[PDB]
DNA sequence: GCGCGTACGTGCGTTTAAGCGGTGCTAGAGCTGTCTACGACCAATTGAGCGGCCTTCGGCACCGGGATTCTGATGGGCGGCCGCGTAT
């Protein structure tokens, strides 16, 4: 669960991962949240976002989903 | 010191609401930008304010004069002294 990530970061962070999937990924609307920086701490290889959030009301949402998986792109 | 009483500490179970991190929204602080009113400053004149000096009537508490009330020597008259004293 989302709260179990913020509550337990040392147990899940000490394990290596390679694939990450999330349903209803609208929680990453702002790039200044604890979950946004928390998911970026896990050393993974590939990610996958399965959601249908409106990426047109704010550019920080689409850009947040761009740099969330590809750090460097605009 | 001692003794009576009971209330408050310690426990468990039940229960209730803080704390967490999640998002959204807009209000109200903070910044910013132009104008100008109100306060500082310098001037000259004026009387409120301070030192210097002594004021007057009213109120607390001691006072003042005059009629009136109570105590003391005075005094004739009715009675009692029984004891020295003159007359036959």
């Amino acid at each position: 669960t989302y709260e179990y990530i913020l509550k337990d970061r040392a147990e899940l962070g000490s394990i290596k991962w390679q694939f990450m999937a999330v349903d209803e990924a609208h929680r990453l609307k702002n790039a200044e949240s604890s979950l946004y920086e928390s998911l970026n701490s896990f050393k993974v290889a590939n990610r996958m976002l399965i959601t249908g959030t409106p990426l047109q009301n704010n550019i920080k949402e689409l850009a947040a989903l761009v740099n969330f998986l590809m750090p460097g792109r605009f």
Side-chain angles (χ1 to χ4, degrees), chain A residues 3 26-28 49 53 57 60 63 65 70:
Chain A
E3 56 181 0
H26 189 43
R27 308 300 298 181
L28 303 181
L49 304 180
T53 168
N57 60 330
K60 302 298 297 180
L65 298 188
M70 294 299 181

Side-chain angles (χ1 to χ4, degrees), chain A residues 25-68 70-71:
Chain A
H26 189 43
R27 308 300 298 181
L28 303 181
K29 181 169 57 181
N30 297 120
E32 301 293 335
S33 60
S34 300
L35 183 60
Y36 192 89
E37 57 87 16
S38 181
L39 295 180
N40 297 329
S41 185
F42 301 100
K43 38 181 180 300
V44 301
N46 297 323
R47 298 179 180 179
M48 180 59 60
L49 304 180
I50 305 96
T51 181
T53 168
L55 299 177
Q56 307 299 330
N57 60 330
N58 299 120
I59 190 59
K60 302 298 297 180
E61 308 180 9
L62 175 59
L65 298 188
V66 165
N67 54 28
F68 177 79
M70 294 299 181

